[PDB]
Amino acid sequence: AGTVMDHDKIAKLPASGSPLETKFQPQLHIGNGCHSYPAVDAQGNWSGGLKPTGAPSAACKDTSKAQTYVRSATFQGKTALVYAWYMPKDEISTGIGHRHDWEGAVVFLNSDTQQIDGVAASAHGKWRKYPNPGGANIDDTHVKLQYSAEPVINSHALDLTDKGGDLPTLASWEGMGADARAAINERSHWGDANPPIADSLIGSSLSGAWMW
């Protein structure tokens, strides 16, 4: 059965995003803190995360571990692509912060044109809403997001950016398999972090990210 595993030993999920999910994956620029890590493996092991002491990016800056998740939904007339990233800790300063970090972004597409009608990005419990993003905030089909510490909200958060970002290996909800979905769905694996694609949170990510 799946067990906890060291954050730097858990194997990533292979790429399983659909062509549409891959097309619209936001770029993610790490302004500060951790790079993204695998929260789970194909066998349903889950990351033990990191204690939020030491430097905010210590032990979580290995780019070979990068992962993104996506769960698709069709929602009130739009295709909604709910992306998520896991960082092993969410630390503002040594001892201030949390083990685990789950971030999310919802890309809403027009039913017909598959044009981006809007993107929303997680800001610890709230969704920032970007109707009709463009210009310096999009590169072709990839909206550009920055991850950074936001001490006023006691957490890291996502915002739209003009800086180029990474596109880590993209595992879809549907492609990752049952054991990995179970391991993300188990909310008690994640302390104070909340995976916005888990079964218990997908509905509120959708209604929360809605901007029409």
Which CB, 8 or 139, lies closer to Na ion?
A: 139
Q: What DSSP element (H or E) covers 179? A: helix 178-185
| CA atoms of 80 and 103, how far apart (whole Å) | 16
Q: Which residues of 166-185 are buried (b: 16+ CB within 10 A; e: fewer)?
A: bebbbbbbebbbeebbebbb
| CA atoms of 96 and 77, how far apart (whole Å) | 41
Residues that bind Zn ion (CB under 5 A): 98, 192
From the list 4-12, 84-92, 134-142, 166-174, the region that binds Na ion by CB under 5 A is 134-142
Q: CB 9: neighbour CB atoms within 10 A?
A: 11
Rg (CA), the chain: 16
Choose the one of Zn ion, Na ion, none that binds residue 139, judging by a C-beta under 5 to 8 angstroms depending on kind. Na ion
Write the CA distances from 139 to 54, 78, 101, 177, integer angstroms.
Answer: 35, 21, 26, 30
**In the complex, minimum distance from the CB of residue 45 to Na ion, in angstroms, rounded to a whole number:** 35
Whether 67 contacts 202, CB under 8 Å = no
**Per-residue x/- track, 86-125, Na ion (CB under 5 A):** ----------------------------------------
Choose the one of Na ion, Zn ion, none that binds residue 78, judging by a C-beta under 5 to 8 angstroms depending on kind. none
**In the complex, minimum distance from the CB of residue 40 to Na ion, in angstroms, rounded to a whole number:** 30
- Note whether 186 binds Na ion by CB under 5 A: no
- Note whether 166 binds Na ion by CB under 5 A: no
User: Is 192 among the annotated ligand-binding positions?
Assistant: yes
**In the complex, minimum distance from the CB of residue 193 to Zn ion, in angstroms, rounded to a whole number:** 8
Q: Which residues contact Na ion by CB under 5 A?
A: 139
**Residues marked as binding?**
98, 192
